[PDB]
């Protein structure tokens, strides 16, 4: 009812191959990889940041 955020699919390097909501998954394969790896890093980084 709020629509304050929007929940995006939590990709990984195993989901990488099967997630198609975010585009570029085969089109821009290395780009896609970067995005997914980057996302993962952010998640990890966020966790670490939170801890800090």
């Amino acid at each position: 009812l709020g629509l304050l955020p929007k929940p995006e699919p939590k990709v990984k390097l195993s989901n990488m191959m099967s997630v198609f909501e975010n585009d570029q998954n085969i089109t821009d394969p290395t780009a896609w990889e970067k995005v997914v790896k980057d996302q993962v890093d952010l998640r990890k980084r966020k966790h670490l940041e939170e801890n800090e």
């Binding site: 191959m17 585009d23 089109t27 896609w32």
Partner: protein, 1349 residues
């Protein structure tokens, strides 16, 4: 009668209400109702109903009511059971209800018995125990039996035993396609045991040692109609332990010879075989058939009554402690003493063995050994078995003197039943009789009254009650009774069958294992008998002359059982699909025959039952099909195999395939060739099961032969070649095929297996019809493959059968590639959903619907049904009775005005054809006459569809068929012509389309209501139900051929027709082959990059020719080397087998050869790879690399050869530079290794790497030079000495990928003049797959359109 209870309940309630007409009384009444119900429930449970607050009078009344109910209820149940037994009449739920009620009462009795026992101690007085324990101990001593020890911690034959145990447990689930929860749990447990075998073993041994308290056993009562009970569902965890114990003790016992030769069932003899052996033994005693000196043989049979149900556990335990390690015995005792639960009514099994505990069979046998010993006496037992060091084969002896010593010639025991063959010299017999008389006075001579006799046989052939003989028999029985205590087993005279062979009684009788047997010697041969039909010829060992006949029948009890089974099958048909019912029937019939082989031909009652049973079964199906019963179905629908679309009933009757129901037709270019029709009869099972005598003689022969062969082999120093034994391979008992089965050495240890099988009736619920022959130890003792083949032949071959069905409707040319989706499978698929019972029922029904549709053209016809011949709405599909399912199917088929559409479509096609050939045939104009929407399905009248004007004039022929070569054009002249597109859904009677056309033309032209313009024209009739055509009418030169051509094309092509065909297929669930394995596609592309090991294979580059072509395209001829690109997309390895050009020198049919070569290479590669590194999925790029590859990959069945809808870009292995160079520079066949992802797997994922490769390769394929340029944009970025690709950084790589993508898309645009925007999905498709795209053909499009409208 069942209403009576209800009435009582109502009445009582009313009375109660009357008694209390108070305030707030309704509520009170309601409460009282519940109380009434609850009391009844309690009673049923056999719990007491002791309500504390309840006031006395009310309570009393309630009690009275329940008593009344009991009086009515129990009695009613009994009556119902009796009725069922009779085979009189009973409602399909009523029977079920009775079975519950009956079960409950059984429980009540048994539990009450137990209670009684508990109250008043064990029935065994200690003296008796002492006697019988003593007997056992002495026997053991005589045998010098080393007791069975506790399974050692590191037991030698332990693992094997465990495996055996697990397999038996599994066996029940192997068949079934779904699993409930309990079953699933059991399966899981089994798996665990398998997988952690050591752990499981430890658990089991621990349990044996220590577990003496157990999860309590449920007893679902069985459904053997003639007499129910019992099935004990033991806890799944305990079950494993039990199973192991059963395996182990039985093995151990067999090793140590615990059980004598006389105890049955043995692992060697199948029950018919056993019977045969017994008969032989009876024949083959010394001077048994001599009755000159007043001799009397007596063959006492009896059931040791209640044997299992009054095994005292203390005594039993003690007995066990003689033969097993005491701990094991204790465990067994504990297990037998469980809480037996049932639908809220428990008891505790303090007395009488539980039959369903896996070991229990062994225990039972052991118990019966005691009884056997008692029956025989120790000495006689010893004589029978022989010495311990060297025991006797069944019924043999060490001498003729020890055989003649005691009266008991032969002894045996099939479980509860025992069989003693006494032989008295006259005097002894007389003495015995006298003794009997003394003990038990007989003044009146009313002993022949009471005496049981084999009423199955004729009066003249059965045991004559010649008083002396009767007395002797009774005396013998008495003696036997005396020999055995009461408290171990009730041996009753009612259950006994004492046949007596004297001077007066020539036929010796007995009934072993369901066979009624009647021995008759040659020296008595001339009394009563026609010697042939249903017999064994008993031949003595010493003489080898035909000594005695042995006449067989199926025992009355067995016949009754069979009848019950048939009835059971019939009732519960409701949900049960026709096919399922048919299968059940087949199973029943096969069970009957394979077992009683020879004996069914004699026993007339059984035959009669079979006749009737089959008829009943047929009628069920008929009923399902239609409320009205048909005059006659064709046998086709029933006896035609499952696979052709029939039911596949295996007839046991003189069924007559009527000559009318063998006709058939075939639409060809030449015309419509017909066939019509000594007499044809559905072949009966009788001919196809080999009689038991033959089997046993055969067995004797072929085993000897086998032995001889073995000896020969030994002499010549060889293992016995299984190739030599072909001919007598599927012969003998056990079959010779057993000896060379791959699990021979494990099934050595599965001992006491027959008895285990027999005893599964108490553990698994749905009862096994092949209890007698464990295929693993015997082999296929029957083969009815021949029968199936013969049935087809009988029904004029496949074609004839099809011509009954709506097969040809589906519009397939041939039936080579087709397959059914089965009905059961369908049912299963939709029984994984949240469904209300109604839905489930509907689903269950659906398999019948399909069947009905299939046989529609020979269910729905005037010969089959008669009456209101109604027209199905909007179609020419006349029904012949509301075959409701069929009707529904038809409606589904011809939804969206399909018939009309078809007709109109055909008309349109015709018009088009006419237009195409105007000037050749002298046609002025072709006008499609506008018709009433209902014209396509006006079967009463008709009308012209396509009017046709002549340029000048047409000389037309006399009205004739479309395939008549002799046509004169001097008959009549005309300026105008017409065409009538007629349709009909024919049925087997009325499906000659040509004839129909002829008739209709004759009628509709002369009839005034059918308004055609000219008197000259043509009627093209298109039979939809058979996909046939014929045109009848007036022809003008050159037209007929054209028409024929159109017809040929129209049937192939016409979109409406195609749509109809598709619909029909859907209805039937027939489908064309295509490929069984699942295609790799955009959908399941993500499946490639899971943990399972895979290999892509490409044969595109194996035979390369080259025609060298530059950017201009100058010609230059050559033929270069090839390669077999085989890529692992996980690891990035590339097993590139370089095919050298020397292979193709002096070869022809080259392409085909190449494929084979590729396959071979692949196989080799697979072989090279170890079991760990081997592939699960060989993905193959090209379509038809499957077959050769499959052939070459039989040895690796774990490997699954997938095709792919992706036009995968490994074609561009030769676009890659280094690879190309290596291909060029190989001078021989050479396997080469490359990492196609040279570096990337340390940086990025495997999937990512693969994607990159796809991108690059695809680009290369699209435009090689361009791709190369893109790759080598910056010359600083160096390709390494051991790499295939330039070592980019990540950003650089991304850039490259982008460029590649652009190249791909730009190129696409250039080629296919398409806008470069599209969808992302589309883009993905273009890259990954380069797949066909959803490109439905024009025909397909048309079909779709038709469907829509």
């Amino acid at each position: 009668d069942a209403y009576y209870d209800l009435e009582l309940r109502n009445s009582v309630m009313d009375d109660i209400l009357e008694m209390m007409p108070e305030s707030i009384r309704q509520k009170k009444a309601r409460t009282i109702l519940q109380h009434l119900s609850e009391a009844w429930r309690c009673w049923k449970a056999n719990i007491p109903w002791d309500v504390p607050g309840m006031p006395a009078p009310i309570k009393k009344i309630i009690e009275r009511y329940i008593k009344s109910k009991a009086d009515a209820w129990v009695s009613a149940a009994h009556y119902n059971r009796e009725r069922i037994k009779r085979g009189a009449h009973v409602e399909k739920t009523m029977v079920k209800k009775n079975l519950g009620r009956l079960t409950r009462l059984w429980i009540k009795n048994e539990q009450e018995r137990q209670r009684q026992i508990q109250k008043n101690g064990p029935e065994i007085t200690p003296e008796e125990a002492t006697t019988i324990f003593s007997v056992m101990v002495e026997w053991l001593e005589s045998r010098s039996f080393s007791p069975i020890p506790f399974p050692p911690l590191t037991y030698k034959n332990d693992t094997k035993i465990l495996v055996l145990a697990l397999e038996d447990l599994k066996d029940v689930y192997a068949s079934k396609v779904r699993l409930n929860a309990s079953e699933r749990e059991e399966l899981a447990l089994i798996e665990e045991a398998y997988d952690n075998p050591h752990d499981t073993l430890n658990r089991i041994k621990k349990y044996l040692l220590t577990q003496r308290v157990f999860k309590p056993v449920d007893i679902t009562m069985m459904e053997n109609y003639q007499n129910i009970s019992p099935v004990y569902s033991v806890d799944p965890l305990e079950k494993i332990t039990d199973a192991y114990l059963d395996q182990y003790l039985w093995y151990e016992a067999d090793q140590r010879k615990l059980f004598p030769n006389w105890i049955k069932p043995s692992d060697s003899e199948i029950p018919p075989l056993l019977v045969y052996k017994w008969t032989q033994g009876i024949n083959n005693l010394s001077e048994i058939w001599d009755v000159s000196r007043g001799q009397s043989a007596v063959l006492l049979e009896t059931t040791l009554g209640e044997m299992a149900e009054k095994i005292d556990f203390t005594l039993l335990n003690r007995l066990l402690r003689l033969i097993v390690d005491p701990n094991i015995a204790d465990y067994i005792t504990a297990k037998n003493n469980v809480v037996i639960n049932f639908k809220d009514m428990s008891h505790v099994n303090k007395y009488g063995l539980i039959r369903g505990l896996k070991f229990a069979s062994f225990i039972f046998q052991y118990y019966g050994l005691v009884i056997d010993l008692l029956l025989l006496g120790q000495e006689r037992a010893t004589d029978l078995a022989g010495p311990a060091n060297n025991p006797n084969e069944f019924m043999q002896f060490k001498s003729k003197e020890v055989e003649k010593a005691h009266p008991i010639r032969l002894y045996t025991r099939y479980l509860d039943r025992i069989y003693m063959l006494f032989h008295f010299e006259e005097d002894e017999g007389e003495e015995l009789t006298d003794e009997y008389l003394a003990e038990n006075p007989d003044p009146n001579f009313e002993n022949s009254i009471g005496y049981n006799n084999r009423k199955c046989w004729p009066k003249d052939s059965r045991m004559r009650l010649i008083r002396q003989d009767v007395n002797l028999g009774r005396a013998v029985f008495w003696e036997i009774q005396s020999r055995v205590p009461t408290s171990l087993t009730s041996i009753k005279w009612e259950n006994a069958f004492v046949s007596v062979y004297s001077k007066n009684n020539p036929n010796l009788l007995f009934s072993m294992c369901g066979f009624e047997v009647r021995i008759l010697p040659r020296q008595r041969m001339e009394e009563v008998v026609s010697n042939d039909e249903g017999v064994w010829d008993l031949v003595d060992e010493r003489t080898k002359q035909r000594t005695a006949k042995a006449y067989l029948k199926v025992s009355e009890e067995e016949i009754k059982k069979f009848d019950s089974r048939i009835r059971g099958i019939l009732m519960a048909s409701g949900s049960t699909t026709f096919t399922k019912v048919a299968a059940k029937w087949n199973t029943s019939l096969i069970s009957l025959f394979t077992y009683f082989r020879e004996a069914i031909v004699a026993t007339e009652p059984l035959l009669d039952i079979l006749v009737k049973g089959e008829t009943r079964i047929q009628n069920r199906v008929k009923l399902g099909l239609n409320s009205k019963m048909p005059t006659r179905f064709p046998p086709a629908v029933f006896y035609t195999p499952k696979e052709l679309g029939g039911l596949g009933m295996i007839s046991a009757s003189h069924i007559l395939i009527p000559a009318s129901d063998l006709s058939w037709s075939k639409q060809t270019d030449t015309g419509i060739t017909h066939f019509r029709a000594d007499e044809k009869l559905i072949p009966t099972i009788f001919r196809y099961i080999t009689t038991w005598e033959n089997e046993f003689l055969d067995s004797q022969r072929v085993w000897a032969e086998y032995a001889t062969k073995r000896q020969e082999a030994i002499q010549q120093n060889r293992r016995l070649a299984f190739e030599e034994l072909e001919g007598s391979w599927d012969r003998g008992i056990p079959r010779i095929s057993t000896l060379f089965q791959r699990d021979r050495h494990t099934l050595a240890y599965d001992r006491g297996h027959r008895i285990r099988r027999e005893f599964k009736q108490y553990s698994l619920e749905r009862n096994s019809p092949f209890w007698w022959t464990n295929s693993h130890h015997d082999g296929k003792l029957w083969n009815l493959n021949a029968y199936r083949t013969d049935v087809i032949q009988a029904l004029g071959g496949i074609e004839t059968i099809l011509e009954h069905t709506l097969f040809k409707g589906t519009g397939f040319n041939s039936w080579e590639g087709l397959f059914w989706e089965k009905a059961s499978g369908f049912e299963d698929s939709m029984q994984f959903k949240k469904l209300t019972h109604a839905q489930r029922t509907g689903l269950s029904q659906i398999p019948n619907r399909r069947f009905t549709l299939w046989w529609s053209p020979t269910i729905n016809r005037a010969n089959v049904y008669v009456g209101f011949l109604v027209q199905l709405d909007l179609t020419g599909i006349f029904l012949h009775g509301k075959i409701p399912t069929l009707k529904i199917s038809l409606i589904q088929i011809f939804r969206a005005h399909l018939w009309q559409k078809i007709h109109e479509s055909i008309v349109f096609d015709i018009c088009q054809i006419l237009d195409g050939e105007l000037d050749v045939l002298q046609i002025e104009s072709v006008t499609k006459e506008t018709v009433h929407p209902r014209k396509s399905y006006k079967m009463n009248s008709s009308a012209a569809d396509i009017t046709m004007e002549s340029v000048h004039e047409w000389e037309v022929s006399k009205p004739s068929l479309l395939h008549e070569t002799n046509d004169s054009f001097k008959g009549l002249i005309t300026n105008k012509m017409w065409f009538d597109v007629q349709l009909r859904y024919g049925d087997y009677d009325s499906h000659d389309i040509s004839r129909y056309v002829r008739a209709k033309f004759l009628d509709y032209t002369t009839d005034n209501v059918s308004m055609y313009p000219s008197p000259t024209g043509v009627m093209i009739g298109i039979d939809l139900a058979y996909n046939m055509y014929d045109a009848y009418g007036n022809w003008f030169n050159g037209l007929k051929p054209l028409i024929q051509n159109s017809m040929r094309t129209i049937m192939k092509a016409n979109p409406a027709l195609y749509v109809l065909r598709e619909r029909i297929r859907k209805g039937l669930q027939i489908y064309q082959s295509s490929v069984q394995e699942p295609f790799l596609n955009s959908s399941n592309y993500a499946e490639l990059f899971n943990n399972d090991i895979k290999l892509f294979v490409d044969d595109t580059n194996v035979y390369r020719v080259t025609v060298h072509k530059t950017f201009e395209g100058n010609v230059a001829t050559k033929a270069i080397n090839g390669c077999i690109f085989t890529l692992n997309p996980k690891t990035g390895h590339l097993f590139l087998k370089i095919i050298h050009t020397s292979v193709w020198a002096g070869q022809k049919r080259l392409s085909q050869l190449a494929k084979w070569k590729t396959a071979e290479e692949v196989s080799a590669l697979v072989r090279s790879l170890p079991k760990e590194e081997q592939p699960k999925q060989i993905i193959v790029t090209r379509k038809a690399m499957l077959d050769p590859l499959e052939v070459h990959m039989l040895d690796f069945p774990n490997i699954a050869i997938r095709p792919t809808e992706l036009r995968l870009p490994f074609s561009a292995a030769m676009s890659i530079d280094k690879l190309s160079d290596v291909v060029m520079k190989a001078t021989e066949p050479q396997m080469v290794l490359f990492n196609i992802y040279d570096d990337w797997l340390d940086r990025i994922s495997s999937y990512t790497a693969f994607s990159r490769l796809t991108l690059l390769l695809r680009a290369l394929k699209t435009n090689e030079e361009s791709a190369k340029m893109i790759l080598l944009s910056d010359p600083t970025i160096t390709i390494k000495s051991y790499h295939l690709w330039p070592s980019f950084t990540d950003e650089q790589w991304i850039t490259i990928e982008s460029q590649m993508r652009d190249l791909i898309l730009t190129e696409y645009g250039r080629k296919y003049n398409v806008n470069i925007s599209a969808l992302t999905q589309t883009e993905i498709k273009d890259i990954i797959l380069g797949q066909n795209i959803k490109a439905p053909s024009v025909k397909r499009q048309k079909m779709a359109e038709l469907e829509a409208a």
